[PDB]
Amino acid sequence: MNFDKREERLGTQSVKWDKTGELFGVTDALPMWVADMDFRAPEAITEALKERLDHGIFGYTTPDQKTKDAVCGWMQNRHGWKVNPESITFSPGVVTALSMAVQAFTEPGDQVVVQPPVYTPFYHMVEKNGRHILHNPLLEKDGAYAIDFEDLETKLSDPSVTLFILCNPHNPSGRSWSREDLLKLGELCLEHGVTVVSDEIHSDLMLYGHKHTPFASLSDDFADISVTCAAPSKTFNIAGLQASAIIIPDRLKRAKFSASLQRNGLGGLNAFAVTAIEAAYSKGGPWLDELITYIEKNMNEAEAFLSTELPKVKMMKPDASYLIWLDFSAYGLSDAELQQRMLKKGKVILEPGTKYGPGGEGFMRLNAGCSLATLQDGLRRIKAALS
Amino acid sequence: NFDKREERLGTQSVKWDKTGELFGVTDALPMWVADMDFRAPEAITEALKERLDHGIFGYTTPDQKTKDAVCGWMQNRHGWKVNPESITFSPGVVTALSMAVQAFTEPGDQVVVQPPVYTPFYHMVEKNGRHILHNPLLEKDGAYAIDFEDLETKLSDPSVTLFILCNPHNPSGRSWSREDLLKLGELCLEHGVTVVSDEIHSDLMLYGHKHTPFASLSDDFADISVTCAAPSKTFNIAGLQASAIIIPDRLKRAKFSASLQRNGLGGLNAFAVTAIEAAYSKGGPWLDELITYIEKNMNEAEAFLSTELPKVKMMKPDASYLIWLDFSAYGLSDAELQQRMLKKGKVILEPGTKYGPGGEGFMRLNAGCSLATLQDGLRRIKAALS
Ligand SMILES: *Cc1c(COP(=O)(O)O)cnc(C)c1O
Ligand SMILES: *Cc1c(COP(=O)(O)O)cnc(C)c1O
């Protein structure tokens, strides 16, 4: 493949490139914010979409035995994890699945534990459904995030806590939790009667031979209290297609999740979604393995550059994915001022760290899912941003 | 060109590939679920190729020119002025109905519908802890009419908060008159009921029938209505999951958005964003060519039914490609009618059962197909009835 190839994305109705005016107040800044890549989907996906377009009929389209086998086959090949086809419910996206899972496995007024800072919709899919966020803040220990197990046990044992949403890899930072972290979390959740939603959407994008451990893979018991959200969207840059496989080995939990879909008038995938998730999990491998190497070399360049040129900026090197959580605390600036210096003076758009709630103060997130050249330009824009 | 023979077996089509699971047969001609056996308009497939060639499928959002396409259609096809601020995108009309029910009622509230009607109307009320209240349709002159005296009684009940209008009405394809709609609006305005109008059959007006959007009739009506429109039935693209929901009243639009956010919805897929624009922008003449082919298909059905199966009363539909067929005069049970159709004739209709009360003795025949496929359908219906 050829990730250095320069793409024009202006005028493609791209949220990342075309909605900067609406969302940031600038038209002339390099977009490096929302988590989508600047790359063409693999040819293995587009071949098969063009094939679906050629048939020319776009009526009611359903996933089938071969769609499920591509999901199962992929999880066994990439992650060593056995999934029965029957475990899989499709969804138009993982944020939808987060919402459905909240509605299915908790009551109005329950508490849901998350580990902040974290992906913003975790807050929204709990708060907007009249459930309550209880935070288990992560600890910064040695330029990497660690889980605080003493706080978690205190939080998980309150009787109104019925759900825990795990982000693994964690967004932001790209932290890949250890087997032992998951085992400790799992046992606490069994003990305290807490269903686990595992958001594993970044889990294919593992850097430097970091190993992903799907929570549900660890025991029967874990499998029976888990809802794993997986998707080709981050892995193959096809968020645009609204395709998710949600894995729920417990029949009763699956039926409750399905019921939430039915109630809200959902359960269909669009016809392109159905082609895309079969092609992606069938023939995506080789392209992913070239993307990892490409992202590794992008991450080595950002680390090289910041530690040399910007020594007050502290970069968490991610274990996975193409998003870099960056610490600008040392500059003593408001989040309001940091962002204006990036927007007006560097001409670059990063995600402001306050988006991710407590612990996001003084950080911003940088989308390194672009050609080396675009990354080098953006790094220079961050330096420029700071006098 | 609608006479081209089109292969749909092996294409993950619910209609053609899910018969074994849903009807217990794989050797029958499927003429049940409401999608067509035709290629979409070239105006949509050509714009789809453009987005495919660009080769990147990240987060894609509707823009002003998407909402303009929608306002262009409603102005050009209907004479309805729609401000872009009024449009909220949804992945589907069933999704919209669920959202409307959750946004505009309380649990325990009663929701009026006119049976027999599209099955999801019942599910999206009952499954959400709301109560279906029937305003049954009367058969008069072999066509449906509204029972306004019964309707007035029911809209008066104070726990009734929502009316779900099907216009055109599935099943039957009935296109409600200006007069019908003015009287319905008056009652809901009188009794503080919110009107959800499913208008998804509204662009396939046959034989000079004219669709009247509820919302178009006055500011009073606009402001209590939720209009669910889509290109999906009109252009055979239900599998691109695109729809446009028109809420002129800003407060009800806010509550409807809030139901979409709450459910982690709001986004359209990249192809839907393309498809809805192209369809409402450039689909006009392909649709006129389709109205004409449907009209021929209906004429053939009426001619064949009046001559070869005169016991069958066809409701000639005002709109869409779905034929509501009364098999009463045969005296088979609903269950024997379906086993005869599926096992003897080896053809699949929608059993009128599923549409609720007023549905017994009926089945719905899908004529959205080549005249050849329809003639094979009618031949199999006659074989089933011997
Ligand atoms: C980007 C992202 C998502 C997005 O899910 P969709 O399927 O695109 O709705 C969900 N979770 C995490 C952690 C993400 O980073
Ligand atoms: C087919 C049909 C629908 C389904 O709409 P989607 O866009 O597929 O959700 C809704 N309403 C009526 C009356 C229909 O006939």
Numbering used by the authors:
A (entry chain A): 1 to 387
B (entry chain D): 2 to 387
Paper passage:
Once inside the cell the terminal glycine is cleaved by a dipeptidase (PepA) to release Cys-3M3SH (2), which is metabolised by a C-S β-lyase liberating volatile 3M3SH (3), which diffuses or is exported out of the cell (4). While the PatB enzymes are poorly characterised and the genes are not associated with amino acid metabolism gene clusters or operons, the orthologues from B. subtilis (PatB) and Escherichia coli (MalY) are known to have cystathionine β-lyase activity, suggesting that these enzymes might also be capable of Cys-3M3SH cleavage. ShPatB and BsPatB are homodimeric with each subunit containing a PLP moiety covalently bound to a conserved lysine residue in the catalytic site (Lys246 and Lys234 in ShPatB and BsPatB, respectively) in what is termed the internal aldimine state. In the course of a typical PLP-DE catalysed reaction, upon substrate binding, the ε-amino group of the amino acid substrate displaces the lysine residue from the PLP to form an external aldimine.
The PatB enzymes from non-axillary microbes B. subtilis (BsPatB) and Streptococcus anginosus (SaPatB) did not discriminate between the two ligands, while the enzymes from Corynebacterium jeikeium (CjAecD) and E. coli MalY (EcMalY) had higher activities against cystathionine, similar to the MetC enzymes included (ShMetC and SeMetC), which have little or no activity against Cys-3M3SH. In contrast to ShPatB, the BsPatB binding cavity is more solvent exposed and composed of charged residues, thus enabling the binding of polar substrates like cystathionine and the hydroxyl group of the 3M3SH moiety of Cys-3M3SH.
